Amino acid sequence: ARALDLLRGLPRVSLANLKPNPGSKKPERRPRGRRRGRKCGRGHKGERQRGTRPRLGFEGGQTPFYIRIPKYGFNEGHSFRRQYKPLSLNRLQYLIDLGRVDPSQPIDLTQLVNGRGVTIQPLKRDYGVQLVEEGADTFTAKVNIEVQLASELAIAAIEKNGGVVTTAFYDPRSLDIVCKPVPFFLRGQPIPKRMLPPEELVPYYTDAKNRGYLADPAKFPEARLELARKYGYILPDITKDELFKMLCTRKDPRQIFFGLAPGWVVNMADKKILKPTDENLLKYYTS
């Protein structure tokens, strides 16, 4: 290069030559001298100087600003209002193109995260992903996406290209397992079983309009044709697709991973999966 040629005719680099990058190490300030310290910046006598002025927000006895304004539930319940990380179609296309997610394989939450497409935080009351309509135009991909919500426009964008989208549910205990599985397989606990939605959400996941994972898989064609008829395209017959066997695959409720049955134990050290045989354990897990 150019600089590497400069270094040849300079002295050897050593710990006697180093330097900080200029502008980084701002100099220090100490109260010594006629400028820094005669009162060291603290001002005249008064409780300002002694370090005894009232608490942050005390307006001198007048009723503080943050106490003369009435209460209102702007935040009541905030710890329990569920949250969902958006996954815009723009982002899904971008991830597909650069080879991060694989559209020739069912796209669940695990494969969105293992491609670093979204960052899920179970501990902050994120329940999962929601597809958003942004970028409905220019989305051209055949994906079998399993998300936790979807606007009807996203359902359209995924259908118009011969794709299946299904809205599942994940409870806060299993969402952590699905989002970061290898930690769970390290804990040594047997794979739990997904809980069912809460009371307020079953009417959502048992409705064909939302491709719910608990609605009857016979009202779906009516929903798909209705959506197509409203959004002016022709519902492609997916049954003839070259890899429709994949777009069909779905996770039944009470299952976290695709080919794993609740109650199994993953042994990563030896590359094995251990299954129980006691009848009571199978009874508990299969329910």
């Binding site: 300002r48 370090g51 002025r53 608490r55």
Partner: protein, 97 residues
């Protein structure tokens, strides 16, 4: 007068003993070792400070938590007094509110 008259004895420093010749070795054990270990796991020192930093109040709180029940009675009483004072100072005294 507060200045010495004779010259001090010469403090001879051996810049190539074992401690200096091998300083820093294994400070990239993580990046160059498949991340088995971490640099903090080479910090030798107090139980309650290996790989952690903070102001005096946090340091004293941490000392109390991790070895408070192993401390001598008078040292522990001093520590509690120190925490009490630092709480008062850091939370009520100062230029900035």
């Amino acid at each position: 007068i507060g200045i010495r008259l004779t010259l001090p004895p010469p403090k001879v420093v051996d810049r190539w003993n074992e401690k200096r010749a091998m300083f820093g070795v294994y400070d990239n054990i993580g990046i160059l070792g498949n991340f088995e270990k971490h640099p903090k796991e080479l910090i030798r020192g107090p139980i309650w400070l290996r790989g952690w930093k903070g102001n005096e109040l946090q340091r004293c709180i941490r000392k109390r938590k991790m070895v408070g029940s192993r401390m001598f009675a008078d040292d522990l009483h001093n520590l509690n007094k120190r925490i009490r004072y630092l709480y008062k100072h850091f939370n009520r005294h100062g230029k900035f509110r």
